[PDB]
Design an enzyme around this catalytic site. Structure first.
Site, PDB file in Angstrom:
ATOM      1  N   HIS A   1       5.092   7.016  11.001  1.00  0.00           N
ATOM      2  CA  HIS A   1       4.460   6.717   9.744  1.00  0.00           C
ATOM      3  C   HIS A   1       3.652   7.953   9.387  1.00  0.00           C
ATOM      4  CE1 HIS A   1       3.258   4.373   6.460  1.00  0.00           C
ATOM      5  NE2 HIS A   1       2.890   3.263   7.065  1.00  0.00           N
TER       6      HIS A   1
ATOM      7  N   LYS B   1      26.953  -5.952  -0.495  1.00  0.00           N
ATOM      8  CA  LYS B   1      28.292  -5.388  -0.319  1.00  0.00           C
ATOM      9  C   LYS B   1      28.512  -4.703   1.044  1.00  0.00           C
ATOM     10  CE  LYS B   1      28.913  -4.895  -5.309  1.00  0.00           C
ATOM     11  NZ  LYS B   1      28.258  -4.298  -6.520  1.00  0.00           N
TER      12      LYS B   1
ATOM     13  N   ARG C   1      11.519   3.758   3.415  1.00  0.00           N
ATOM     14  CA  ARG C   1      11.068   2.994   4.562  1.00  0.00           C
ATOM     15  C   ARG C   1      12.216   2.070   4.944  1.00  0.00           C
ATOM     16  NH1 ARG C   1       5.799  -0.917   4.793  1.00  0.00           N
ATOM     17  NH2 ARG C   1       4.911   1.161   5.172  1.00  0.00           N
TER      18      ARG C   1
ATOM     19  N   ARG D   1       0.827  -1.196   0.000  1.00  0.00           N
ATOM     20  CA  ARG D   1       0.000   0.000   0.000  1.00  0.00           C
ATOM     21  C   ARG D   1       0.866   1.252   0.000  1.00  0.00           C
ATOM     22  NH1 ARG D   1      -2.601  -4.307   2.051  1.00  0.00           N
ATOM     23  NH2 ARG D   1      -0.409  -4.677   2.606  1.00  0.00           N
ATOM     24  N   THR D   2       1.780   1.332   0.966  1.00  0.00           N
ATOM     25  CA  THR D   2       2.578   2.542   1.128  1.00  0.00           C
ATOM     26  C   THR D   2       3.373   2.812  -0.137  1.00  0.00           C
ATOM     27  OG1 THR D   2       2.782   2.129   3.519  1.00  0.00           O
ATOM     28  CG2 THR D   2       4.153   3.865   2.566  1.00  0.00           C
TER      29      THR D   2
END
Ligand SMILES: [Zn+2]
Ligand SMILES: [Zn+2]
Lengths: 143, 310, 143, 310, 310
Positions: D134, D84, D105, D54-55
């Site tokens: 959020h 790495k 995020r 969704r986000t």
């Protein structure tokens, strides 16, 4: 034979109990009479059910053409059979069966099953609305 | 409002001959004259819950060619569905509030169908649902077949390999059998035979088909030799004998092919076509693949644009 | 009535179907007759089962004690009741049930289920012969 | 130059009521009248170091709706950082020389904050930093709440589930407590109770809140029933008892809900909402989700465009 | 033929007070006056399907100290039940044609009872079956209480830790309840409560038992403090919180303990007993362990040798 209600005659042997379980038939206060393994001139050995003051739908009566094809449903009023229906195969069956395809999407998700019904040579074909594969009705189990 | 505007494209079995023809027509028209701002201001979901290269890349490419934007995912590993255990329905219940159409491929048969029931007024285009259907492959297959053969009717089509799990040939046989007088040859191990449901359909439509056990039996009769890969990742345990290919097409095997015949393959190929076929004038799989662009452009234009492109 | 067989009378409504499933009683070619929701030899509502040519050991009848303690079993021969017995709480119930304990050795292995039965307050308790845990008869499902 | 132009959006706690209101206003204005070339010639990073559906999808979709381009990654597995072993700082030290804003995020609390310290004159929008904040969920949450309730003040809000690790409710409680006379009900296992820092804030602001242990206790008082998923993947070992949901909302439980009350859920849901709630007139989570598009469009327009959209 | 000749030793619940005393009495005789060859010409099975140190080692040592031979496996990994999925039944069916007695530990409860059903005239000694019973642990426990309190009647006995999954405390309570006026203290997390069946049996026999939340409430009036380990490999998901020892005994806790009281533990221990307890006069777990040799010689002698020992 009873005051008023339904009599399902000519169910095949070993099916009667099934239909009891299936249509949650035994879940009433009504008088029910069940004979299992009755002799039957008509077929060979037969099962038979009577529910008093209770009637069947129309599709429920056709969703019966699956297991009890040559069954006869008598509508009874005042001790007299005032109706004589027969189960004819429906176009489809919803909610009740489960797709034998283990990879069918139907299993995982918030959806009712659904199959298409067409008469074949020896059996009845069931095509699942979802995975589009076809099965014999013998193969298909119930839920 | 064209017949295909806002229609889900789930399964060949849900499409008329008129429909297919209409895609092919719309197609070539755009290969003739690109229309690059057609789907401007459209955002499409490219939702691949299982691996793809040709199907995905061609789709996203087509979306761009028509001027649309693409959001999506190339595997389910990094969605809520993979890590957080979310239903497909819920997944399709949110994305469908985001985008203008959902292109999706899923490991389970019936997934694209299920999405339509939660997708609202958003169309779903099935990019492959388990071993079931592959409408868009078929659309390009058709296009390629018209391209190279002149017609879609009265053809001798041979399909070889995994016919049970190959969604490609399911959709293609249903499509072709909506045209006149086509005839089929099926070359498959008994364990991966073309399913009874396609056969029963051929029979009801009174369409000639027959099984064989070698390619040569039919070589000289064939207009289109459609090779397929064994769906290793869709097999059941009692089928692991069938992992390796059973029929390997080589260039030597093309001695007696009619001149018109093309070899197709939805790809990717393992070994069912040896690389020495690539050079012959019969190889047409890469060309076939490139045709995915015009089939899909077409489909998208048709579904998301009311009026036919001139 | 029947000629020769067993008759289970005075089954409390809604148990009849249970007993028919739980003990796989209709799994026979023998002629059976069943009435659901009847007025009683005693009480108000009542279920009833008759099965031809079939008999129950005193143990088989005791098994009923957990589902229909008031039931009466009549042994019929030549249309006459020659015997009349009543369910008392048994020592064990073999075969019918499945142990709720998922880690029980009884699941994977080729042995029959078996519990000891005892009355525990207003309830019956079952102790699996194998894992030795204890459950209320209410939780322990049938095959 | 609007107040939010070039501002990092890291944490609700860094935003005024005026700010939130401004996003919501800007929002609906664009849902009213799309402005599709607004962020033309902008490239935005969609940098998801942990899973999102969704986000992410809503963000990239919004970016497109405003005419911007998107580069990014949907997991850290195939970056230099995963294979790495690169610092976040270094990672944010290069990307910030590429793009015009960074949406990101991350699994660790504080990651978006850290990025601002290396991101230069490039804004960072926090799409979720561990169990912390959020901001963008909250923006849509607010929007949804205004949409369905008429106001943002004087509400009876219940929040249920994992309140300790749910970044969603941290940001939302801070946001709501910047408006007048809201009152909270917290329904959580003791192990996942709303953290002391949110409580201490409520108290300083003189805001009524209380704990309960069932939904019913408060059902009939509630305007917004905000359900949350247990953050399985953020738990500590001594909390694995709490993996399963503790409160399952069913349709039967909605007998006594005030008529106005909506059930929200930032999603995805496991079982804390049974699918039989979907059909009731109280379910509003999918609608809520769809509102992510307008909240995020707004936020992007505000941060990357000097002058307010009319 | 003594009362245990050729008898299965599966559950304390199938043994009499005299049975237990018989074993202990025998134990002493053999400890005072060894009998190196009392079981010459015997071959015994040491079948351990789950891990074991004390129980398997002590047991095999007993077999050698009486002149018997051992065959077995310490791990169901290299058997035909481990790499070829044989039923435990078939496994017993063949092993019981090889040996004169079987000692088995198994992860499923009821494994030992089941083996008796397939071994014919070959006795079966339970060495632990999942969370059910641990008969021969109860016998060394009993021998150890005996040697340190000079009796088995009228004791104040505390049990600490995981009583639900503790096969050690299931057998020992049933055995102590077979003597007179012993009083019990059950100290454990709600989720790992001593099972209802054990409590019902105590009640039935009118034995005083009580729950407690800490070790200090009972410390002053206990004769035997019996610590256990949280059975993590047997826990259910919903119980994973309890993994960590909730009651940690340490030397300072023993300050107002009785001069006579001993701390016991079946072992192994995680942290439940701090190592500073090890040197105090109350520590008796290692002595306890060493006692297993005698109880197990005893038990083996009675089961395999017709005539009582001298
Ligand atoms: Zn299906
Ligand atoms: Zn059991």
């Amino acid at each position: 034979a009873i005051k008023r209600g339904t009599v399902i005659d000519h169910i095949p042997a070993q099916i009667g109990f099934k239909l009891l379980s299936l249509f949650k038939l035994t879940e009433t206060d009504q008088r029910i009479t069940i004979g299992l393994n009755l002799p039957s001139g008509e077929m060979g050995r037969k099962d038979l059910i009577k529910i008093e003051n209770t009637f069947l739908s129309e599709d429920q009566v056709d969703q019966l053409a699956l297991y009890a094809p040559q069954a006869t449903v008598n509508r009874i009023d005042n001790y007299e059979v005032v109706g004589k229906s027969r189960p004819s195969l429906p176009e489809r069956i919803d909610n009740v069966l489960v797709c034998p395809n283990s990879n069918c999407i139907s299993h995982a998700e918030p959806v009712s099953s659904s199959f298409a019904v067409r008469k074949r040579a020896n059996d009845i074909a069931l095509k699942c609305k979802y995975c589009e594969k076809e099965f014999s009705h013998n193969v298909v189990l119930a839920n | 409002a064209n017949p295909l505007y806002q229609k889900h494209i789930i399964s060949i079995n849900d499409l008329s001959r008129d429909d297919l023809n209409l895609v092919l027509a719309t197609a070539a028209k755009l290969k003739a004259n690109p229309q690059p701002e057609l789907l401007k201001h459209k955002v499409i979901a490219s939702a691949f819950f299982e691996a793809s290269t040709r199907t995905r890349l061609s789709f996203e490419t087509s979306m761009h060619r028509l001027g649309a934007s693409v959001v999506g995912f190339s595997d389910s590993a990094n969605t809520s569905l993979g890590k957080k255990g979310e239903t497909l329905a819920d997944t399709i219940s949110v994305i469908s509030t985001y985008v203008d159409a959902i292109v999706m491929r899923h490991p389970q048969e019936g997934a694209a169908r299920l999405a339509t029931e939660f997708s609202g007024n958003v169309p779903v285009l099935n990019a492959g649902d388990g071993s079931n259907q592959h409408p868009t492959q078929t659309l390009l297959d058709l296009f390629t077949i018209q391209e190279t053969q002149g017609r879609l009717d009265n053809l001798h089509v041979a399909m070889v390999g995994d016919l049970k799990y190959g969604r490609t040939v399911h959709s293609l046989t249903q499509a072709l059998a909506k045209f006149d007088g086509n005839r089929f040859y099926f070359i498959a191990p008994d364990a991966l035979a073309m399913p009874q449901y396609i056969l029963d359909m051929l029979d009801e439509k009174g369409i000639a088909w027959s099984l064989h056990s070698s390619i040569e039996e039919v070589m000289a009769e064939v207009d289109i030799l459609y090779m397929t890969r064994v769906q290793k990742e869709r097999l059941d345990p009692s089928e692991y004998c069938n992992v390796k290919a059973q029929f390997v097409l080589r260039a030597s095997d093309l001695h007696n092919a009619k001149a018109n015949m093309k070899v197709l393959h939805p790809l990717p190929r393992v070994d069912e076509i040896a690389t020495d076929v690539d050079k012959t004038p019969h190889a047409w799989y890469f060309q076939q693949a490139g045709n995915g662009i015009f089939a899909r452009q077409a489909l998208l234009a048709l579904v998301l644009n009311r009026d036919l492109v001139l």
